Design a protein around this ligand. Sequence first.
Ligand SMILES: C[C@H](CS)C(=O)N1CCC[C@H]1C(=O)O
Ligand SMILES: [Zn+2]
Ligand SMILES: [Zn+2]
Length: 230
Amino acid sequence: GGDQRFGDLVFRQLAPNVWQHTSYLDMPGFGAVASNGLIVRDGGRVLVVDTAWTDDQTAQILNWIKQEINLPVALAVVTHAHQDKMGGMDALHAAGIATYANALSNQLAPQEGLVAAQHSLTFAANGWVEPATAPNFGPLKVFYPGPGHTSDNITVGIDGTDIAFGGCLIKDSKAKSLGNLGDADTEHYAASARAFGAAFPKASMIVMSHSAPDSRAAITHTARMADKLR
Ligand SMILES: C[C@H](CS)C(=O)N1CCC[C@H]1C(=O)O
Ligand SMILES: [Zn+2]
Ligand SMILES: [Zn+2]
């Protein structure tokens, strides 16, 4: 279709200023598993959502940005303390990029075998990021929907687009399962999925970690599967 290959990664333009990055990691019982994040150009800078699985892959994301956009990466926000989302933090840091995560992600990252972000986000009781903790986030709208896939999972909308990113909270409309639930909050998951949908009620393109972009039926379907856990 429109997928651009760059080394071992894939880049898909979703909107004029927005690309999805995709990287892969072998896992037993699963094969080579895709993880998606985002790249957003905001004026004269670039914003990244999530690393790739590894430092090397993350450096390749930066190389793609250099080749295709050739503007500084002002910051990255990473959406929970798992390897697919934070595996590449040292590559961002080597590159001089300021990093942000949920406070709880930074607290958990060491024991997860991950490097913490440099800056912690905290969230109002209504789930919206406290805006003073997310300086220079431009069009990124960061929302904590409650515990679900993990206790620390956060989501991101993009102002001026029809896109909302569910990270590993949301699976596609035909997904057979919710994946590994080892760190999940099975009581709260369905509500958290629905809270994501309600935070971004206008988004028609739902982007997520482990499926291609889908309609909002991804949210309804994920929530319906999560209903079965409680
Ligand atoms: C390591 C990642 C973190 S979200 C994971 O748990 N995955 C990646 C694909 C599905 C699921 C699994 O192993 O069940
Ligand atoms: Zn995860
Ligand atoms: Zn994941």
